[PDB]
């Protein structure tokens, strides 16, 4: 797991271990990667993508921050001009004179603390360190990397945004953070662990407009 | 950028076409990760539940 407990609090350690029960971190990372790949491949043909395949990444490469890798290895069938590696939150369209064919995308999982919640800056620093990493040998030097602030429910990516792919990456990340399956399960487990449960909406009343709505195929017994 | 709005709407619908519930989707993902499927009793319960749901949907 990505929980780097800087200290020894047995109560909080037990709570965190129970929250991540049944090998949740690796499954969540794999689910996020698969969701990103599916979202890309849904309309990859229009975005000039040749072939999208996930590289052979070790299970310990989804939680070890010391050594990273590339998540998605998607070809482009063309000389994709490698745009300058900048934050996705930036609206500046700057692309240096660099082109290639294979473009990579990466995703990282983090549990930010009160001070480590700056997803954008931490993600930019992680991407910069992975560009010149000693062991994180990504195949494409223009390989963007994404980050997930699971503790603070945030996501960011400050890598080489491919031309026309930054809006796609943003939409994919927004849709995931809205309805990521593994992330939703983790959030439900965290809510259950903290004895927190939102007041679920109640059934609405049948006004003069919904008076005839009770004659549908759903059996209603007016008790 | 070419310039357009993303027409992306992804989901997790089972091979039978039924949209798996988020709990059911997480169960399927965990089964795939663990590489283990449902048991005999789990299969029987799933079959009974599916048959009952289909019968209810029939009328």
């Amino acid at each position: 797991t990505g929980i780097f407990m800087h200290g020894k609090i047995p109560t909080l350690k037990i709570s965190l271990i129970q929250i991540f029960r049944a090998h949740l971190w690796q499954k969540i990372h794999e689910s996020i990667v698969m969701d990103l790949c599916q979202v890309f491949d849904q309309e990859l043909d229009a975005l000039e993508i040749e072939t999208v395949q996930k590289e052979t990444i070790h299970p310990r490469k989804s939680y070890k921050m010391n050594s990273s890798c590339a998540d998605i290895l998607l070809f482009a069938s063309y000389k994709w001009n490698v745009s300058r590696p900048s934050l996705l939150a930036d609206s500046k369209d700057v692309m240096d004179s660099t082109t290639t064919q294979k473009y990579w995308i990466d995703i990282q999982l983090r549990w930010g603390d009160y001070d480590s919640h700056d997803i954008e800056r931490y993600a930019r620093a992680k991407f910069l360190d992975y560009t010149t990493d000693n062991m994180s040998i990504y195949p494409s030097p223009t390989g963007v990397l994404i980050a997930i602030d699971l503790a603070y429910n945030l996501h960011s990516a400050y890598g080489n945004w491919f031309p026309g792919s930054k809006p796609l990456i943003q939409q994919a990340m927004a849709k995931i953070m809205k309805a990521n399956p593994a992330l939703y399960v983790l959030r439900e487990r965290i809510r259950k662990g903290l004895q927190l449960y939102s007041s679920e909406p109640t059934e609405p009343y049948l006004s003069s407009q919904n008076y005839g709505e009770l004659f549908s195929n759903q059996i209603i017994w007016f008790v | 950028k070419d310039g357009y709005k993303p027409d992306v709407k992804i989901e997790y619908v089972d091979e039978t076409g039924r949209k798996l519930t988020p709990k059911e989707a997480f169960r399927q993902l965990s089964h795939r990760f663990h590489g283990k499927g449902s048991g005999k009793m789990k299969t029987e319960r799933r079959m009974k539940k599916l048959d009952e749901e289909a019968l209810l949907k029939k009328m």
Binding site: E30, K54, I57 | E15
Partner: peptide
């Protein structure tokens, strides 16, 4: 011509009980 949607299956790569090597296969 309409808007036909065909969502392909998403078989997640096996992680546990692989009984193989360390790195995930292709």
């Amino acid at each position: 011509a309409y808007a036909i949607n065909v969502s392909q299956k998403r078989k997640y790569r096996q992680y546990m009980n692989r009984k193989g090597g360390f790195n995930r296969p292709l």
